[PDB]
């Protein structure tokens, strides 16, 4: 239009608009019709933008139920490598060496978690009100405690690194590097200033728990959830509990000495020290974005204290018995547990084949492999012992090194005083008949759409008795089968457990 | 790392997957758990992808209710130009010339509509089964009729172009260029092969119907909606109705000749001919995508035959009577009409301020002004004449040259035999208490999410009695005010109706 | 003939299939008719491939 | 605090929180901050330099 | 001392002139939010100044306590007394003071 070219001054004076609204603060759009107040709650003048979502992952060996599993193959390989350069101590097995290594991984994950907690609290920007209190709430700490005891937190994480330097683990194996990189980073969905932050929080750890002559057993160790005012004393208690049965074990000292002899001190994994001038910075990572987008929730871990009607002895433990399954490492968990002893009908929508969504047109093999690391489809229902089966558990076909349990989203409340909100959910949400459930689900959906590569959702309704497929924007997709997913997971786990 | 570089053959054999699923057919994902067949409806194995969305717009002069309106200023300017450049017949006025120009615009819109109908039918690609049957269904024709009478269709559209080209309209007025570029193209949401098509269909035309000493009055003319199997005889009836009082008229010939002398043939607007070798291609245009995204539906038009209890005489006509308002062109419609004589509760959600969402970080004034041409917010409810007010009508604060009435989306059915489906909706969707309404609304939302720059949604619930804000992914947004939008529309209309001097 | 040479892109997109299934694991072919689950053993969805034969 | 007052870090933290009590959570203040961020670029703003143990 | 805008009693004061200038500069590059005035913008700016002064005060309090010389017995207990803090508290919680002033700077970086 030549009129715009002829009157740019009037165009500029007519197009003066304030952009770049700082996120993390509640905004009211106002009323276009000033007399619409008679319809009080029939008009939505509120506008809240979420700014962070936490992916509650879990480190796993990858579906071992016999001696042909990648975990057992890596156990045999690492034991052969250690013992063929070892002249001396012969009192442990490949399985024992691998439980060590897994405990090393768990405490490395803990160190990365606490280091991220420390480095986040120094982040303050005018364009984002979520920084850093929302992130600290999502990770499950007390921002006031961190602000008051920054020095204590720094020295505690440094001491954690120093004490983790006592034992030795291989650095060629990429398990530790992948887990630390995943759990020690902030990821934006877009390369924009007011972007949304993606976080990974370990839902659980692997307290080593040696007792009895019937091998070892990695018992679950729970982790703080979002909205928990956990302090440095609680985190120190957690670390001491983790390393309580880890030091003072002469067999563990023997394993550490043998791996130190095998892999030289230069070839070990070392936790880097941190100081006051270390700044964590959100980064754009398309690979992590894609693998977050193609992630499927598996539910809460099952503990000994968790009651389950008809499913006894189904805890998430890594059992190692020399006289059971020929001494192979066994880890066969049952998914579909949410936390309460009821059906959780929403998990029924996970029984369909997953859809792998990818950006762009041409996809490389490595990118496709990295894009399905968190994907996990159920295969069969676990057989309930007894006539009562109030919960329903699904046995997976095979999973990768990490499994996603929940997703935590933090957003501004619509009501006064517009504080942060805690939203934990799986890939499937069940909405029963209620006055506010539908609008709450609508707010949930709109908040999730703000994130670019959000995980695909599977909504279900209690009144229609009908679920829904992926609630996502499909760009370049394919239908994945359980066998293909199992092959990809086997490849990825074997590659991760390599020396 | 090294393991991938050490077994790349097995990596490739494991990562060979079929991609680029052709859209336009129902895809069944199967069952991962073979025992899930007991839960019949609790597992959604269906996967349907929408392929086209139609924007049912309406050309408007731009909110005239006085002689000071931009349309009247432009009418005075163009009449002065023509009368000063010409010597001879002085028997019409600025208002008469302006309604002549509006009728010419309506004819051009109709010709572009039929030309696009003809040109779409020759589109076929293996990766999109929506071409061209779904596009024709959205446009409101019978694809069987088009393929049976292609020759008759080409002759009819060629005669329409020939008969519309007899009259003259200025090409320097960018009104015609904007309308033609809007109604003569297919637009993809992404620059990918399996993209979704954006389309523009005129909901209403502006039949002249010149009669009486009381000036002229451009009455609405309806057009075929989607899902109507209208044929060439119906389109010929529509054209003959449009030009019944316009072809062979001496005063109209006088006005067309005067416009020719004013703007000789070089400066006149011309319709491009269509034949068997004309191919239309989908194109990617971020400007039209943005102005689609920031578009707010205003509801169905009000006709003289449409009953409205408490709102009598609110037809969408362009009145020009010399004895009222000093002979100025009058056009002030009442929005909020859906088609039936009831409340239409979903329109209450539009009383909030609109949010102008734009891509990128830095936005030029050009993009900001071009991204809000279809936007329209209500200002005050129109008063109901009498004590009964079953419908509710909202008076706009000021609109651009086009107002969007409805949206139509075409997608495959989940059930056998997976035929196309018609989904007509405004920006606001109302769901009452029903077993199927919630799942249907979820299907609608998931279909809309597939479109990239889809218009923002305002859902309301029957048992909640509560609406919801913009159901869209905001990237870089601002809250727009009624006064700012009125200024923007005034500038846009003034720029739209421009005449050289 | 000429149609294949005229839409080779769609030919390739339609004929992209994963081959070379690694032997040594049980493969489930699934159900083409979703209502075939009633006939429990009348549909053989299993597919097992032997891998070694020993001559004693 | 005046001279001869044994004010501690808890008292200073209380003073800072009191100062910024009615400063955060104000949407009008957030709007002003966004507008001045848009006007003066992030390079053109005033930044408080960080301090460490070796600052004398 | 005490920070002051400088004796405003009408609209010709330098504070009001600067308010008008800064509001014009902000609003002539602003397309969007129009809900505050020049006076409101200037009260913000003054609150920003007050908290910047507070940060400088606490930073000086922190940096003084590390000063010890044999030629001056006032260093640093007399200065800490004059500023109004507890030198024993600063000596015991130097790390807490450093992290508190750093967090003060970070939170002042929001606006």
From Swiss-Prot, chain D:
Lineage top rank: taxon: Viruses
Modification after translation (UniProt): The 7 kDa polypeptide is acetylated. Autocatalytic proteolysis releases a post-translationally modified peptide that remains associated with nucleic acid within the virion. This peptide is observed only when nucleic acid is packaged in the capsid.
Signal peptide interval: none
Description of how the protein assembles with itself and partners: Homodimer.
Task of the protein: The capsid protein self-assembles to form an icosahedral capsid with a T=2 symmetry made of 120 subunits.
Comment field (misc): Picobirnavirus particles are capable of disrupting biological membranes in vitro.
Protein known as: Capsid protein precursor
Source species of the chain: Human picobirnavirus (strain Human/Thailand/Hy005102/-)
Lineage summary: Viruses, Riboviria, Orthornavirae, Pisuviricota, Duplopiviricetes
Gene field: Segment-1
Parent-record interval covered: 270 to 325 of 552
Swiss-Prot record, chain E:
Assigned keywords, A-Z: Acetylation, Capsid protein, T=3 icosahedral capsid protein, Virion
GO CC list: T=3 icosahedral viral capsid
Signal peptide positions on this chain: none
Coiled coil, from the record: none
Modifications the protein undergoes after translation, according to the UniProt entry: The 7 kDa polypeptide is acetylated. Autocatalytic proteolysis releases a post-translationally modified peptide that remains associated with nucleic acid within the virion. This peptide is observed only when nucleic acid is packaged in the capsid.
Miscellaneous remark of the record: Picobirnavirus particles are capable of disrupting biological membranes in vitro.
Complex and partners: Homodimer.
Functional note: The capsid protein self-assembles to form an icosahedral capsid with a T=2 symmetry made of 120 subunits.
Name assigned to this protein: Capsid protein precursor
Record organism: Human picobirnavirus (strain Human/Thailand/Hy005102/-) (PBV)
Gene: Segment-1
Boundaries of the shown chain within the full protein: 103 to 213 of 552
């Amino acid at each position: 239009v030549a009129w715009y070219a002829r009157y740019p001054h009037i165009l500029e004076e007519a197009t003066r608009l304030p952009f770049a609204y700082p996120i993390g603060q509640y905004y009211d759009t106002g009323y276009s019709v000033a007399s619409a107040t008679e319809w009080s709650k029939y008009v939505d003048t509120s506008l809240t933008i979420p700014g962070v979502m936490c992916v509650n992952f879990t480190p796993t060996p990858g579906e071992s139920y016999n001696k042909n599993s990648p975990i057992n193959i890596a156990a045999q390989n690492v034991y052969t490598y250690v013992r063929h350069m070892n002249s001396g101590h012969a009192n442990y097995e490949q399985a024992d060496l691998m439980m060590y290594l897994l405990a090393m991984d768990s405490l490395y994950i803990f160190h990365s978690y606490v280091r991220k907690i420390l480095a986040i609290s120094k982040l303050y920007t005018p364009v984002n009100k979520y920084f850093p209190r929302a992130l600290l709430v999502a990770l499950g700490v007390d921002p006031e405690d961190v602000f008051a005891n920054q020095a204590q937190w720094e020295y505690f994480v440094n001491m954690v690194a120093y004490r983790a330097g006592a034992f030795a683990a291989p650095a060629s194996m990429t398990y530790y590097e992948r887990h630390a990189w995943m759990s020690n980073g902030l990821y934006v969905d877009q390369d924009v200033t007011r972007a949304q932050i993606y976080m990974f929080k370990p839902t659980m750890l692997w307290k080593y728990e040696n007792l009895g002559t019937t091998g070892t057993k990695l018992v679950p160790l729970m982790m703080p959830k979002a909205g928990d005012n956990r302090k440095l004393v609680d985190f120190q208690v957690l670390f001491n509990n983790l390393v309580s049965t880890m030091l003072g074990d002469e067999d563990f000292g023997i394993m550490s000495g043998d791996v130190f002899k095998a892999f030289g001190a230069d070839g070990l994994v070392k936790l880097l020290a941190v100081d006051s001038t270390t700044m964590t910075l959100p980064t754009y990572d398309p690979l992590i974005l894609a693998q977050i987008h193609s992630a499927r929730a598996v539910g809460a871990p099952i503990l000994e204290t968790s009651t389950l009607t008809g499913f006894p002895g189904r805890q998430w433990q890594i059992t190692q018995n020399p006289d059971v399954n020929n001494g192979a490492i066994i880890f066969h968990p049952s998914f579909g547990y949410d936390g309460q002893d009821h059906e959780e009908l929403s998990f029924r929508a996970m029984c369909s084949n997953m859809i792998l969504n990818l950006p762009g047109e041409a996809h490389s093999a490595e990118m496709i492999i990295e894009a399905t690391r968190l994907a996990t489809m159920f295969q069969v229902k676990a057989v309930p012992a007894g006539d009562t089966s109030k919960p329903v558990l699904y046995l997976p076909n095979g999973f990768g090194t990490e499994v996603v349990n929940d997703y935590t989203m933090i957003s501004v409340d619509k009501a006064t005083p517009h504080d942060l909100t805690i939203h934990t959910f799986f890939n499937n949400i069940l909405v029963p008949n209620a006055k506010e459930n539908y609008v709450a689900n609508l707010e949930l959906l709109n908040n999730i759409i703000q994130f670019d590569w959000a995980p695909q959702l599977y909504l279900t309704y209690g009144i229609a008795q009908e679920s829904f497929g992926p609630f996502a924007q499909l760009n370049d997709w394919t239908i994945l089968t359980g066998e293909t997913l199992a092959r990809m997971h086997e490849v990825c786990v074997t590659s991760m457990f390599d020396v």
